Ligand binder design. Structure first.
Ligand code: NA
Length: 298
C-alpha cells in the first residue's frame, strides 16, 4: 500500500538491485525519495535496521516510511535536493580551507559515531555524501546509501560495539571491522584531497585503467606538492597524508582525525580561495574509475 499513500514520479537512480524514484506523500504534498528494492535479487534487512536505528542522526539520511508488498520493499527517505557535496564544492570557485575543515568535521563526526556503535559504511564514495537542500550549511549534509554497511556482532551473533569486547568475537572479524573502518577514513581522505586541489589523488579521469589506479594506490606515495598544493596549509597536507596512509593499521581513526590541529584550530585556517583545478566532471569520472577499480571483486 505504498502507492495508496504516495504518488510515484521519476527515476532518480537505476541499479542492478533497486530503482530510486522521487515520490509525493499524497495527503501532505511533501516530496520524498523511494528506494524500491527487488526482494528476489537482494535482502535489504541490514540496511533498513541501520537506517531505523541511526537515521535520527542529523547528518545521516532519515527514514520516513517503509513498505513491503511481497515482491518489492519500498524505503522512503528524505529527498536530497542540494545535489552531491563534492561536486557542489568543486564548482565553488572561492571555496577555502576553513570551509573544507568545517565540512570534514561534520562528516567525520558522523563516521566517528557510526564506528563507535559498531557500524561501518563500506561505500563512502563522494556520490553517497549529499546535501538535503541548497542552504550550503553543515546541518544540510547527509551520508546516504547504507546498502553495503555492516553492524559488528559477536561470535553468537548478538549486536556489539568495538568497546564491549567482554563477549567473545573472533579477533578475525575485529580485524576485518578495523580494516573496513580504516577504508571509511581512506575514502574521507580521498574526499579531502580532492576538495583542496580539485583533482583526485589516484586517477586523472574516467579513462584511467583499473590497473594504473590500483598501482598508484599501492605505491603509497602521492603528490602533496606543486601548483595546486604548494599554498595549502602544511597541517592540511599532514592530515591528508595520514588519512591516505597505504597501511590500514597506521591510518588515522575518525577519533584521531577529529583531534588533528587542522580540524581543532579551524579558526586559524585561511578563508581566501584555494588554488584548484576546475574540472568537476573530470573528477566525477576519475572517482567512478577509482571505486570501480577497488570494488571489482564484490
Ligand atoms: Na537523519
Amino acid at each position: 500500500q505504498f502507492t495508496d499513500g504516495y504518488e510515484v514520479k521519476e527515476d532518480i537512480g537505476v541499479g542492478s538491485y533497486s530503482v530510486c524514484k522521487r515520490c509525493i506523500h499524497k495527503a501532505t504534498n511533501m516530496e520524498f525519495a523511494v528506494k524500491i528494492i527487488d526482494k528476489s535479487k537482494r535482502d535489504p534487512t541490514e540496511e533498513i535496521e541501520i537506517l531505523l536505528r541511526y537515521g535520527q542522526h542529523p547528518n545521516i539520511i532519515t527514514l520516513k516510511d517503509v513498505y513491503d508488498d511481497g515482491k518489492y520493499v519500498y524505503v522512503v527517505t528524505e529527498l536530497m535536493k542540494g545535489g552531491e557535496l563534492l561536486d557542489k564544492i568543486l564548482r565553488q570557485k572561492f571555496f577555502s580551507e576553513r570551509e573544507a575543515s568545517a565540512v570534514l568535521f561534520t562528516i567525520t563526526k558522523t563516521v566517528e559515531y557510526l564506528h563507535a556503535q559498531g557500524v561501518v559504511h563500506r561505500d563512502l564514495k563522494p556520490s553517497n555524501i549529499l546535501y538535503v537542500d541548497e542552504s550550503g550549511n553543515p546541518e544540510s549534509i547527509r551520508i546516504c546509501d547504507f546498502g553495503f554497511a555492516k553492524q559488528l556482532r559477536a561470535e553468537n551473533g548478538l549486536l556489539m560495539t568495538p568497546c564491549y569486547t567482554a563477549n567473545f568475537v573472533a579477533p578475525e572479524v575485529l580485524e576485518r571491522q578495523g580494516y573496513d573502518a580504516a577504508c571509511d577514513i581512506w575514502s574521507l581522505g580521498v574526499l579531502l584531497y580532492t576538495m583542496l586541489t580539485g583533482y583526485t589523488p589516484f586517477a586523472n579521469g574516467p579513462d584511467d585503467t583499473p590497473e594504473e589506479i590500483l598501482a598508484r594506490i599501492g605505491s603509497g606515495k602521492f603528490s602533496l606538492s606543486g601548483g595546486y598544493w604548494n599554498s595549502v596549509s602544511d597541517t592540511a597536507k599532514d592530515l591528508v597524508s595520514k588519512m591516505l596512509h597505504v597501511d590500514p593499521h597506521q591510518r588515522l581513526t575518525a577519533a584521531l582525525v577529529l583531534r588533528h590541529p587542522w580540524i581543532v584550530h579551524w579558526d586559524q585556517l585561511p578563508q581566501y580561495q584555494l588554488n584548484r583545478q576546475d574540472a568537476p566532471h573530470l573528477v566525477k569520472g576519475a572517482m567512478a574509475a577509482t571505486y570501480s577499480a577497488l570494488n571489482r571483486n564484490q
